[PDB]
Coordinates of C-alpha atoms in Angstrom, one line a residue:
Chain A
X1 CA 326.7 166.3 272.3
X2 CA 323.2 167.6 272.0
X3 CA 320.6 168.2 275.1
X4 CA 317.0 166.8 274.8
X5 CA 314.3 169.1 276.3
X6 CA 312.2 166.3 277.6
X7 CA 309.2 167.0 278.0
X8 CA 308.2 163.4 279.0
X9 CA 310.3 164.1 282.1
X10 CA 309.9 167.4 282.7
X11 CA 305.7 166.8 282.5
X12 CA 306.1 164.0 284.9
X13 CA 308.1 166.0 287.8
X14 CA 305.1 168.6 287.2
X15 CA 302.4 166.3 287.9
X16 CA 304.1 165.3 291.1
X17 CA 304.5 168.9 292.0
X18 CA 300.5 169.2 291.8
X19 CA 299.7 166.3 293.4
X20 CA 302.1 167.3 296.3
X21 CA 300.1 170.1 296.3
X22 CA 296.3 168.4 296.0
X23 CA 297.8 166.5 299.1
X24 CA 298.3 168.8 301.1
X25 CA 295.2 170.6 300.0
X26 CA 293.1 167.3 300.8
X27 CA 294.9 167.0 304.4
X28 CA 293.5 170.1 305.6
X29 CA 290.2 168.7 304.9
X30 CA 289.5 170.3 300.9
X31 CA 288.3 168.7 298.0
X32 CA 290.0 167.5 294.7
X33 CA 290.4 170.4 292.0
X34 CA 287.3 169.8 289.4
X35 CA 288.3 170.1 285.3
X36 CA 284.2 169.7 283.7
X37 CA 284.7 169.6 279.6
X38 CA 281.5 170.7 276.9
X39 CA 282.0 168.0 273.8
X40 CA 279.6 168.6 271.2
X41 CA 278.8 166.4 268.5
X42 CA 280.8 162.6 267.8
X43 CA 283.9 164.4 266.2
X44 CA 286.4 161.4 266.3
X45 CA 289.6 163.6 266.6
X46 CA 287.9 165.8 269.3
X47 CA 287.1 162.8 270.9
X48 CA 290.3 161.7 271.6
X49 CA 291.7 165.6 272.7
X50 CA 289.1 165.1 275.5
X51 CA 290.1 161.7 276.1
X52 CA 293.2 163.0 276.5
X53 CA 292.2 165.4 279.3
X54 CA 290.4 163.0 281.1
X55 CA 293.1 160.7 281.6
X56 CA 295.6 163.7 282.6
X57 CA 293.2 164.3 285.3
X58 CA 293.4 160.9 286.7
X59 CA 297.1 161.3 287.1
X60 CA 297.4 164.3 288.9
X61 CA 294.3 163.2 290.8
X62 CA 291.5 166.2 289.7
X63 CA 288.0 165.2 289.7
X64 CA 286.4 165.6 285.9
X65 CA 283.4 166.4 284.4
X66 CA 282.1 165.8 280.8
X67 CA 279.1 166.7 279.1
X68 CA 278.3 165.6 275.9
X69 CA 275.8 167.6 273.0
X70 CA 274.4 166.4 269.5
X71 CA 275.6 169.0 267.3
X72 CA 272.2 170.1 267.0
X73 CA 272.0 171.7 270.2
X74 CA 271.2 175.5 270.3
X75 CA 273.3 178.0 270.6
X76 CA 270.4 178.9 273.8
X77 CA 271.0 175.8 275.6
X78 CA 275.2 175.6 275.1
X79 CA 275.4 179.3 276.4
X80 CA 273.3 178.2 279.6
X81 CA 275.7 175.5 279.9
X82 CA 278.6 178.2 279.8
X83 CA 276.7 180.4 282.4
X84 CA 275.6 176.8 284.5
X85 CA 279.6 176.1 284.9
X86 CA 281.1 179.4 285.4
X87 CA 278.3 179.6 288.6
X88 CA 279.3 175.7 289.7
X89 CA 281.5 176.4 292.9
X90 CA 282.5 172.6 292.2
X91 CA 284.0 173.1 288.8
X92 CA 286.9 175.3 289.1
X93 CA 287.7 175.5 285.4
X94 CA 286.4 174.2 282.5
X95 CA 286.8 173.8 278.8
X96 CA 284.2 173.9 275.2
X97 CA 285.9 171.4 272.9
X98 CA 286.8 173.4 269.6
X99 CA 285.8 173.2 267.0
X100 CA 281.5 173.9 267.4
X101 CA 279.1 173.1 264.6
X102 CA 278.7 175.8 262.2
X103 CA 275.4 177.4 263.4
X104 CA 277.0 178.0 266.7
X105 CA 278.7 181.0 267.1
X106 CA 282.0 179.8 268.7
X107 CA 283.1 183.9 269.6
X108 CA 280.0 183.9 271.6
X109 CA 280.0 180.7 273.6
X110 CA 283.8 181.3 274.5
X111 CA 283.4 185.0 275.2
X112 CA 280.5 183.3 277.9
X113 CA 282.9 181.6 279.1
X114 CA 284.0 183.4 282.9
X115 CA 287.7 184.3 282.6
X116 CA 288.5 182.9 286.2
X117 CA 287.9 179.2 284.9
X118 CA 289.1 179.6 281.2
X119 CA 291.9 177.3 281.6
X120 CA 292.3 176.7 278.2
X121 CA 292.8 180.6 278.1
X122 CA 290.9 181.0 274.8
X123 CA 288.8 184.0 275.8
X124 CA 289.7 186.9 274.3
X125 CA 289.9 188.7 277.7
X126 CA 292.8 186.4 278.7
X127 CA 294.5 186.7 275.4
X128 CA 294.4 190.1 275.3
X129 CA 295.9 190.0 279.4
X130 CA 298.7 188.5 278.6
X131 CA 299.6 190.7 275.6
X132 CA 299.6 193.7 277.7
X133 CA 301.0 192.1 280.6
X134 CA 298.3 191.7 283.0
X135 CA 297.2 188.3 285.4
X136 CA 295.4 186.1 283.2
X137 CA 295.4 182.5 282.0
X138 CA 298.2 181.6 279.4
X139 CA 296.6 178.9 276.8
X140 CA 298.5 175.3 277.4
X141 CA 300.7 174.7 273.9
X142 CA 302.7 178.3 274.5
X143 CA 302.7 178.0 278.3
X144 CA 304.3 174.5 278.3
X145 CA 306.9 175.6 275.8
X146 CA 308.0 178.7 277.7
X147 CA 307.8 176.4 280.9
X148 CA 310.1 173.9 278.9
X149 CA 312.6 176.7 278.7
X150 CA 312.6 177.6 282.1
X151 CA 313.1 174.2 283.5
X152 CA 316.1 174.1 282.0
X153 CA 317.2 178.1 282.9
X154 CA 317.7 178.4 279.2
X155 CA 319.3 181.6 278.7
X156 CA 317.1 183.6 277.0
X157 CA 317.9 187.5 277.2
X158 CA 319.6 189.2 274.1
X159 CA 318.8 186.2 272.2
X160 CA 317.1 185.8 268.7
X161 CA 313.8 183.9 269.1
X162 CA 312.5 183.0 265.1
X163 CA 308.8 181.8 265.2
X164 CA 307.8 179.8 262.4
X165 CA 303.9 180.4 262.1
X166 CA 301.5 183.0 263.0
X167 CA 298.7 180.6 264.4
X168 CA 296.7 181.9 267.2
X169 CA 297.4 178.6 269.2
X170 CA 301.3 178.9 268.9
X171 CA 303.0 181.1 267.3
X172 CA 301.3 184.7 268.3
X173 CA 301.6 183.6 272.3
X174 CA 304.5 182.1 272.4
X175 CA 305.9 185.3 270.5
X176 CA 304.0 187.2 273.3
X177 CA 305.4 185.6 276.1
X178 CA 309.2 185.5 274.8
X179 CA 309.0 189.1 274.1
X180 CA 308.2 190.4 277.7
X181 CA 311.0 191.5 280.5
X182 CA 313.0 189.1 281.8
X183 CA 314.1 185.4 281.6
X184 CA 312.5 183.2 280.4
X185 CA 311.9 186.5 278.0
X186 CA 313.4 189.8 276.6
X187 CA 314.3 188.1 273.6
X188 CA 314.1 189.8 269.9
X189 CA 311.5 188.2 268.2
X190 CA 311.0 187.7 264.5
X191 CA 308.0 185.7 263.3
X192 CA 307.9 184.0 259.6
X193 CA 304.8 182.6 258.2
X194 CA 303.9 181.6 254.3
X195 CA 304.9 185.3 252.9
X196 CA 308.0 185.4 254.6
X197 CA 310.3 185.2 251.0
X198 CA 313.5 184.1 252.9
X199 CA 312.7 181.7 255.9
X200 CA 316.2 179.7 255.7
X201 CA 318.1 183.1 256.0
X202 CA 316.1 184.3 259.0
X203 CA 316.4 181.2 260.7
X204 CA 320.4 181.2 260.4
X205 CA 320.5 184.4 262.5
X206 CA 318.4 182.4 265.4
X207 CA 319.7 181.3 268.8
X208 CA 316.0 179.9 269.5
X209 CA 313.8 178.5 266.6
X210 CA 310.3 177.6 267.5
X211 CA 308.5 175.6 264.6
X212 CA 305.0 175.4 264.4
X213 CA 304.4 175.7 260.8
X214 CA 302.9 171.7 260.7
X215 CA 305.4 170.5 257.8
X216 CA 307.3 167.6 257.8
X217 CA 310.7 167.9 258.0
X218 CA 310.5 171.5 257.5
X219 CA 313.2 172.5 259.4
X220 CA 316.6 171.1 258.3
X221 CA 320.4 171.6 259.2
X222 CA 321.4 173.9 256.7
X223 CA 318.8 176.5 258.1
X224 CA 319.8 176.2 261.5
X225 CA 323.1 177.2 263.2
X226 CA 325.2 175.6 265.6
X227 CA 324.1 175.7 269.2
X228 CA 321.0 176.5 268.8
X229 CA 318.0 175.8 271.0
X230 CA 315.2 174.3 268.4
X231 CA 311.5 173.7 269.9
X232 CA 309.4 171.2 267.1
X233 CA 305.5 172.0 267.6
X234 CA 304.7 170.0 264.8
X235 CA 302.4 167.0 265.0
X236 CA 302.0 165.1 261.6
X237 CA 301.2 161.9 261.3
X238 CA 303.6 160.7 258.4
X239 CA 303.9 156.7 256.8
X240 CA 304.7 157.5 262.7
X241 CA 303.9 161.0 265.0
X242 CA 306.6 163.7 263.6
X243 CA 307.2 167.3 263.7
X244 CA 308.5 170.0 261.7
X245 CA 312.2 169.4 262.0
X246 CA 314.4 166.9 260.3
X247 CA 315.5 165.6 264.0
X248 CA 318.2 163.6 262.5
X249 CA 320.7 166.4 260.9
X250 CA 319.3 168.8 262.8
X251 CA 319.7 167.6 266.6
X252 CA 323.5 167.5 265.9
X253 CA 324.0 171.1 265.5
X254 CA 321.9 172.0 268.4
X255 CA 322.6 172.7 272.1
X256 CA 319.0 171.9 273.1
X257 CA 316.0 170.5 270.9
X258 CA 312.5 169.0 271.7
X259 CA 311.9 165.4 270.4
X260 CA 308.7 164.0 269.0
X261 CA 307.3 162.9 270.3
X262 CA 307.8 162.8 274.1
X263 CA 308.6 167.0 273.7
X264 CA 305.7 169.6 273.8
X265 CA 302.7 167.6 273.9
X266 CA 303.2 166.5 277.2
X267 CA 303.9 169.9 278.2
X268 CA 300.8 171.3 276.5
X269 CA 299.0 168.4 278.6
X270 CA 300.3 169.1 282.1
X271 CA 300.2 172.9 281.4
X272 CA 296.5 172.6 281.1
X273 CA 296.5 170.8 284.4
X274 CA 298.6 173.6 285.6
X275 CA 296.0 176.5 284.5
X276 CA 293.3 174.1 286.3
X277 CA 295.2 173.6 290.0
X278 CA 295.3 177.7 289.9
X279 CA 291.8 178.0 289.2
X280 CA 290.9 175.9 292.3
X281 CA 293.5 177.9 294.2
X282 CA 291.8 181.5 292.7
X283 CA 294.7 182.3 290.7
X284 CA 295.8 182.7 287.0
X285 CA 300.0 183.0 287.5
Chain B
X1 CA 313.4 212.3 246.1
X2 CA 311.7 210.8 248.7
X3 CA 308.0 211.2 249.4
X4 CA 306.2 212.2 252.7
X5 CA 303.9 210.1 254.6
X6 CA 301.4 212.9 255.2
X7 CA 299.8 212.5 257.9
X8 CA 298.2 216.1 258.3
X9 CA 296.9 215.7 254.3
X10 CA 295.7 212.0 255.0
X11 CA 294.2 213.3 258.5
X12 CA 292.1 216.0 256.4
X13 CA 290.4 213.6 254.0
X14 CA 289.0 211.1 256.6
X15 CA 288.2 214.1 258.5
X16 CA 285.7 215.5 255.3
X17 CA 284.9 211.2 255.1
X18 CA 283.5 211.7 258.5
X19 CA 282.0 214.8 258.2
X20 CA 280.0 213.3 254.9
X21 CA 279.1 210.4 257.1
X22 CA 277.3 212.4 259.9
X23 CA 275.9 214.9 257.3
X24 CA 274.1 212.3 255.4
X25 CA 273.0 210.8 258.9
X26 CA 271.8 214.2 260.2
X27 CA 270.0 214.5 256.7
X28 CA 267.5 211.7 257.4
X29 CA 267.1 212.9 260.8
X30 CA 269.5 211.1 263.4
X31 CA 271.6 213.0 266.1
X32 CA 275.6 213.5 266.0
X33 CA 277.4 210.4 267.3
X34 CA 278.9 211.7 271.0
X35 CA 282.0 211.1 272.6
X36 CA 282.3 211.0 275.9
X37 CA 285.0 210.9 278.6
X38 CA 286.6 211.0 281.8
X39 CA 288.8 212.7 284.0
X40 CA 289.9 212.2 287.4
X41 CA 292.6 215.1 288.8
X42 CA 294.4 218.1 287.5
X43 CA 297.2 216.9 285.9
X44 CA 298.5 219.0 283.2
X45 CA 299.3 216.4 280.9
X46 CA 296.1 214.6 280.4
X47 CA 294.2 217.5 280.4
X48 CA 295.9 218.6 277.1
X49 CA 295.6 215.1 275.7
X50 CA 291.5 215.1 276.3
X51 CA 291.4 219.3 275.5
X52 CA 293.0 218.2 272.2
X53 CA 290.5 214.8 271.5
X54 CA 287.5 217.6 272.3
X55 CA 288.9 219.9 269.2
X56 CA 288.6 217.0 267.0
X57 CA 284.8 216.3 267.8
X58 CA 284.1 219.7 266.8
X59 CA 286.2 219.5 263.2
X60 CA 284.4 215.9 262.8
X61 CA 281.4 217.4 264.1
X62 CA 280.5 215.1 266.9
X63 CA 279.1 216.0 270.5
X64 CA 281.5 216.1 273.2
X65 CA 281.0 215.2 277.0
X66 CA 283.8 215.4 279.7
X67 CA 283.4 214.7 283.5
X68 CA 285.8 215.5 285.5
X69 CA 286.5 213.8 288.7
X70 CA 289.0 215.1 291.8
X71 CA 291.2 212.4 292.3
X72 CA 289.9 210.9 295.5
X73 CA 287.3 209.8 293.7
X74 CA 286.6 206.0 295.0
X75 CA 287.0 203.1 293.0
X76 CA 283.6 202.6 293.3
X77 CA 282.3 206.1 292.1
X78 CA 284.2 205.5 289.1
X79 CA 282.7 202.4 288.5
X80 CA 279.4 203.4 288.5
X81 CA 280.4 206.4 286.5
X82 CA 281.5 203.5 283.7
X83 CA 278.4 201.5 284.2
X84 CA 276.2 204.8 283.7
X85 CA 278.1 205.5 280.4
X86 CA 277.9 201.9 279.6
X87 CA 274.0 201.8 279.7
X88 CA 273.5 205.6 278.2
X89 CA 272.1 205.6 274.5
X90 CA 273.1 208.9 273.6
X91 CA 276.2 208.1 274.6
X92 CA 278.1 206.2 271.2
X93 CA 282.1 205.7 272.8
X94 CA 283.9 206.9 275.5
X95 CA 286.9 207.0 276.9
X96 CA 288.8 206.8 280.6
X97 CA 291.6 209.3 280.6
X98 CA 294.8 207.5 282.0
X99 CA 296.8 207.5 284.6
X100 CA 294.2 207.1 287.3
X101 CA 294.9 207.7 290.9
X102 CA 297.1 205.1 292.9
X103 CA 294.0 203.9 295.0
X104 CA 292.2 203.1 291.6
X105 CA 292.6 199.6 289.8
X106 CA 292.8 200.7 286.3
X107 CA 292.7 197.3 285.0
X108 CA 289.7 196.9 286.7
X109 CA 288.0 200.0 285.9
X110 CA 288.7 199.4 281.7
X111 CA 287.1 196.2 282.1
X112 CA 284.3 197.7 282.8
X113 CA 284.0 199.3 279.7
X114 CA 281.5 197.6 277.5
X115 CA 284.0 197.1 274.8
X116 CA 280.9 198.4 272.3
X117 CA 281.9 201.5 273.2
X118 CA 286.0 201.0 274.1
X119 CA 286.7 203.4 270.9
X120 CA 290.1 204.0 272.7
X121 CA 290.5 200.1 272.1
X122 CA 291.7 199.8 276.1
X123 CA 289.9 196.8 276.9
X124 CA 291.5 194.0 277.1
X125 CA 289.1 192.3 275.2
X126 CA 289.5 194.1 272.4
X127 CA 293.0 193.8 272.6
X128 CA 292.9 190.0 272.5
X129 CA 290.3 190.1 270.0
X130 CA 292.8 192.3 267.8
X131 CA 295.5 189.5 268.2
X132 CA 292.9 186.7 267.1
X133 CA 291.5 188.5 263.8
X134 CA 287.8 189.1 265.5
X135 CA 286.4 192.3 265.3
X136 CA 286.7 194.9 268.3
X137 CA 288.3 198.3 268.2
X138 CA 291.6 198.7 267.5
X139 CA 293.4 201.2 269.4
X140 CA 294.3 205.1 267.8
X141 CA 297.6 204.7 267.4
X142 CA 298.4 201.7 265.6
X143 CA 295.5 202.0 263.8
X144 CA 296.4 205.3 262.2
X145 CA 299.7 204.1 261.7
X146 CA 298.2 201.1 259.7
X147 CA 295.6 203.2 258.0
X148 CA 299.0 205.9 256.5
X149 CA 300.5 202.6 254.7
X150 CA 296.5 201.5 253.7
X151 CA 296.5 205.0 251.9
X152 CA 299.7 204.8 250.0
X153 CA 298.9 201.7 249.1
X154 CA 302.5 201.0 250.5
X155 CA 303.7 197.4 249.3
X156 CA 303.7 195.3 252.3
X157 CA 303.0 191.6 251.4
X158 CA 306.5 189.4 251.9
X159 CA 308.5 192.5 253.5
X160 CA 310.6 192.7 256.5
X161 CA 308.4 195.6 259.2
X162 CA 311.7 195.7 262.2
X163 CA 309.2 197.1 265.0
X164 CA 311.4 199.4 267.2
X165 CA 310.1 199.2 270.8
X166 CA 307.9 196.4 272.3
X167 CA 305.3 198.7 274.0
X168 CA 301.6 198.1 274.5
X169 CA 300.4 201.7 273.3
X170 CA 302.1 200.8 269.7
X171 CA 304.8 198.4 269.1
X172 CA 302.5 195.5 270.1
X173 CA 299.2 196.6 268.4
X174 CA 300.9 197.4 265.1
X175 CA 303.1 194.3 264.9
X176 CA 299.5 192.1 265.4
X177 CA 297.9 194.3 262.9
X178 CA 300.8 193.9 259.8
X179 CA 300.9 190.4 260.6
X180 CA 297.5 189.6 259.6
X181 CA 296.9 188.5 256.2
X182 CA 296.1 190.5 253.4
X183 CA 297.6 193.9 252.3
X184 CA 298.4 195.9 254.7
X185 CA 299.9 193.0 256.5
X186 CA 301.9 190.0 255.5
X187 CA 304.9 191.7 257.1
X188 CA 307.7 189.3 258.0
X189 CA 308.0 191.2 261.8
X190 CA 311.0 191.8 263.8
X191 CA 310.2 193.2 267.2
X192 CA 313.3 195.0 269.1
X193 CA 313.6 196.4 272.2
X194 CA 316.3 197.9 275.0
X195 CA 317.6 193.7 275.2
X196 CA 318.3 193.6 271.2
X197 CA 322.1 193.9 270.9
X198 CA 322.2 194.3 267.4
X199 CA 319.6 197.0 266.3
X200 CA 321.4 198.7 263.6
X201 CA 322.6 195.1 261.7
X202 CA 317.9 194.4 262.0
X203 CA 317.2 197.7 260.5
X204 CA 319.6 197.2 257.7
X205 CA 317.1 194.2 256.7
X206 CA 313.9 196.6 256.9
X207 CA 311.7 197.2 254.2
X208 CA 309.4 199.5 256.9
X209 CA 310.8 200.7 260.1
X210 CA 308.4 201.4 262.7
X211 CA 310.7 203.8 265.3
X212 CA 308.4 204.2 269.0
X213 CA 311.2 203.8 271.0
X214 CA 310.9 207.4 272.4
X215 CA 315.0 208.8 271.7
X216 CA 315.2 211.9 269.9
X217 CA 317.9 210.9 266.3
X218 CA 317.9 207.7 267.4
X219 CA 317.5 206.0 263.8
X220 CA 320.6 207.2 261.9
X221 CA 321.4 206.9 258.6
X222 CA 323.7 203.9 258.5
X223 CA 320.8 202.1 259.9
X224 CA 318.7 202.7 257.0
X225 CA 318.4 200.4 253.6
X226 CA 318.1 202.5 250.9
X227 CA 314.1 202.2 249.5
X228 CA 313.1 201.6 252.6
X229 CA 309.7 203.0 254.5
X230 CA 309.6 204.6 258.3
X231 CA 307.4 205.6 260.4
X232 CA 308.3 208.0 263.0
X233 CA 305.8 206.9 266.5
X234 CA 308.3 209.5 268.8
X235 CA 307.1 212.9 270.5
X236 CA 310.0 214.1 272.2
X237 CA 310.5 218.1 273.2
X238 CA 314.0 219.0 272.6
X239 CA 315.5 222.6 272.5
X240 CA 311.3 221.8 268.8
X241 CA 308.9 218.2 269.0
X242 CA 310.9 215.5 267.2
X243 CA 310.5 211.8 266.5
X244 CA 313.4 209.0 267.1
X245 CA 314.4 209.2 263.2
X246 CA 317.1 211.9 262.1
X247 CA 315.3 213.1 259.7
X248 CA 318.1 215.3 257.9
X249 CA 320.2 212.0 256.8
X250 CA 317.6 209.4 256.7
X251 CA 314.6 211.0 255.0
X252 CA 316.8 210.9 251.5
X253 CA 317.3 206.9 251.8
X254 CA 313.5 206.4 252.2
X255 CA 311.2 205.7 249.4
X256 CA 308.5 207.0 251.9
X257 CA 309.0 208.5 255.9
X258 CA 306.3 210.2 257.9
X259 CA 307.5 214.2 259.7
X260 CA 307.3 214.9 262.7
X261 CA 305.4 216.7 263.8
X262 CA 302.8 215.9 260.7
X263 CA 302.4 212.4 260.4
X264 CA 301.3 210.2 263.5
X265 CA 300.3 212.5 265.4
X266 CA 297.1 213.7 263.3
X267 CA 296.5 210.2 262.2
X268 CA 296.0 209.2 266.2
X269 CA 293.8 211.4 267.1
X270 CA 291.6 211.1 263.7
X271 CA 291.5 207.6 263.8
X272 CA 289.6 207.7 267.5
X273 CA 287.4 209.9 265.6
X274 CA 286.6 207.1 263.2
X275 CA 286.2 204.5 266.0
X276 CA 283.6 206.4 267.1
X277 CA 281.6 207.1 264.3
X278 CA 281.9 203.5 263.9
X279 CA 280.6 202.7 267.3
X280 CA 278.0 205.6 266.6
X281 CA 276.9 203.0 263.7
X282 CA 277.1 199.8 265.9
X283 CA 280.6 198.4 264.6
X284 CA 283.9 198.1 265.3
X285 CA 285.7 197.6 261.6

C-alpha cells in the first residue's frame, strides 16, 4: 500500500541520462567530463568516500583524478593545489576530501576553491547562492533528495515539510531548497533539532518528514501520520546499514518513504555526478 | 502589562557604545572608521534610504563618503568603482545602494565586494558563511532584530520562533541566526509564507513571532498565544507608518512586542553602524 522512493532506481535512470549526454558530447569530437579529488592523510573512512567517487565515475564514464597528501602537508602547498585545479581546463570540477588535519585551515582551502568547479558545493559562495536564490552549485545529499521528490512529481506546495536536524550537510539546504517558489518547493518548513521540547508533536502535523538526526529508529509510527511522505537520511551502522526511521511500523502509514539502504545514498552519489557533468558543460542548474 | 521592545532606547545605547569605541580610538591617535557608498540614478527612494545611513555616521561619529553615479553608468565603470573601494585603506565598509540599473548585473557587481568590507552583509559569501556558523557580516536587519531579543535577554532556548515571510532581506537571515546554538538561538523555527494555508493555527504555537510579511494588521489577535514575543519587520504608509501586527489587540497578549515605528527600524540602521566599526577594527563578529 506504501510507495518506495527508490533511489537505486531512480540513480540508475540518472546515470543513463548522463552518459546519453557524454555520448553525444564525445560524437561531436569532445572529451570525457574530468572529476580530480584532494585526499589528505590515510583516513580509512575518507578513504572509502573517495573510493566511492571514483567508482561513480566509471559508471557514468567521467575521467578522474586523485591526488593524495600526508597530513603534514602545508597549508602553502594544498592552497596551490586549490589554485593548480581551478586553472586546469582538463578538470572541470573537483573536490578537497573533508575533514583536513587540524593545522590546516579547512575555511581557507575551500573558500580557494573556484565556485565554477565546487561540485561538492561546499564554498560558502555557493551556499550562500542558493539561499538567496541565485545560480550556484547545490551540495549532493540535499540535491538528491529534492531530485528524489521531483522524480516522482511529489506534490509539494501547501505542504508541511518537518526537518529533523540543523546540520549544514542536510538539514539547513534541504530546508533551503523546499522553502523556495514552486514545486518541488513552496512548502512550510519547520526544522527540529536537540532543543526542540516536542519533536513527536511537530512531526504529526507533517505531510513530508525529512530525518537526518543519525539515530536509530528515531522516527517511529506514532509520530508520523498517515500518508505521509517520510525521507530517512540516516546512515548508522547498527548489530547492518540503517537509518533514522523504524521502516517497519513506519512504511505502513506512509504514501512514499525512502529505504535504507538503496534510498538517498545513491542519490547523494549520482547528484555529485550531476553537479560535475554541468561543470564540463559551464553550468551550475 | 506588556512590555515594549524598544528599539529607539536600545538604538541609543549601542549608539553611545560606538561613540566610546571611536573616542578611545581617536584618543591614542587613529582616524574615524568611514563608510562609504554608492549610488547610481535619482530615484527617490534610495536616496532617502542612503540620506538616512549618512545621519547615522554623524550621531556615531564616523566619516561619510557617497558617489553618485547617473544611471547609464556601465557595468564596467561600476566595477572598477568596487575594485577602487575594495583596495582603499581609508575606506573601512561600504555599501552598493540597490536596485541598480537594468543593464547592470547586480549579482555580479556584490560579488565584487571584498566581503571585509560587505558591512551591508550582501555578499553572497557572507550570506553562506552566516548559514554555516563562520564569521562574515551579517546583514542590518536581522542582525538588529537578533541583537533586540540579545538585549532583553528574551528566553529563546527550546521555543517555537513562526517566521512570517520567507524573504532574503529578513525572514531568511533571522531564521539562520535563531537557529544556531546558544542563546539567542535554539529556536524550534517555522517559516511561513503566501503557500502556508494555515497561518493563524502556526502562530497559535509561537513563543516569538517574527511578522515581515509587509500587510498592514495582518497579525490579529486570535492569532496570538498569550505570553508570547513579536516582532514587528513591516513599514507600510497607510492613511501613519505601521507594521503587519495590530497593535491595539495584540500588544496586551504579548509578554514583549516591538512599535512601530520605534523598534526595527532604529535597530537596522544602528546595527550597519556596528558592522562597520567592526570592519573599521578588522572583524566581522
Amino acid at each position: 500500500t506504501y510507495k518506495l522512493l527508490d533511489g537505486k532506481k531512480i540513480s540508475g535512470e540518472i546515470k543513463q541520462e548522463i552518459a546519453a549526454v557524454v555520448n553525444e558530447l564525445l560524437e561531436k569530437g569532445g572529451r570525457r567530463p574530468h572529476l580530480a579529488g584532494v585526499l589528505v592523510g590515510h583516513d580509512g573512512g575518507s578513504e572509502t568516500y573517495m573510493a566511492s567517487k571514483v567508482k561513480a565515475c566509471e559508471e557514468v564514464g567521467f575521467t578522474s583524478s586523485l591526488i593524495r597528501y600526508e597530513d603534514d602537508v602545508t597549508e602553502e602547498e594544498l592552497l596551490a593545489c586549490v589554485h593548480r585545479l581551478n586553472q586546469d581546463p582538463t578538470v572541470d570540477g573537483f573536490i578537497v576530501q573533508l575533514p583536513l588535519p587540524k593545522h590546516i585551515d579547512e575555511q581557507k582551502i575551500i573558500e580557494a576553491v573556484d565556485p565554477r568547479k565546487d561540485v561538492d558545493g561546499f564554498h560558502p559562495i555557493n551556499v550562500g547562492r542558493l539561499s538567496i536564490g541565485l545560480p550556484g552549485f547545490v551540495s549532493a545529499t540535499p540535491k538528491g533528495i529534492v531530485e528524489l521528490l521531483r522524480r516522482y512529481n511529489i506534490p509539494t506546495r501547501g505542504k508541511h515539510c518537518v526537518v529533523l536536524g540543523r546540520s549544514n550537510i542536510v538539514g539547513k539546504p534541504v530546508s533551503q531548497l523546499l522553502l523556495q517558489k514552486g514545486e518541488p518547493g513552496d512548502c512550510t518548513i519547520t526544522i527540529c533539532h536537540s532543543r526542540t521540547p516536542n519533536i513527536k508533536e511537530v512531526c504529526l502535523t507533517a505531510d513530508i518528514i525529512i530525518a537526518a538526526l543519525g539515530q536509530p529508529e528515531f522516527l517511529t509510527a506514532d509520530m508520523v501520520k498517515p500518508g505521509a511522505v517520510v525521507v530517512d537520511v540516516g546512515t548508522t551502522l547498527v548489530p547492518r546499514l540503517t537509518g533514522d526511521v523504524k521502516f517497519d511500523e513506519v512504511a505502513p502509514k506512509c504514501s512514499y518513504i525512502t529505504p535504507v539502504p538503496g534510498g538517498v545514498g545513491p542519490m547523494t552519489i549520482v547528484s555529485l555526478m550531476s553537479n560535475t557533468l554541468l561543470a564540463s558543460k559551464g553550468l551550475y542548474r
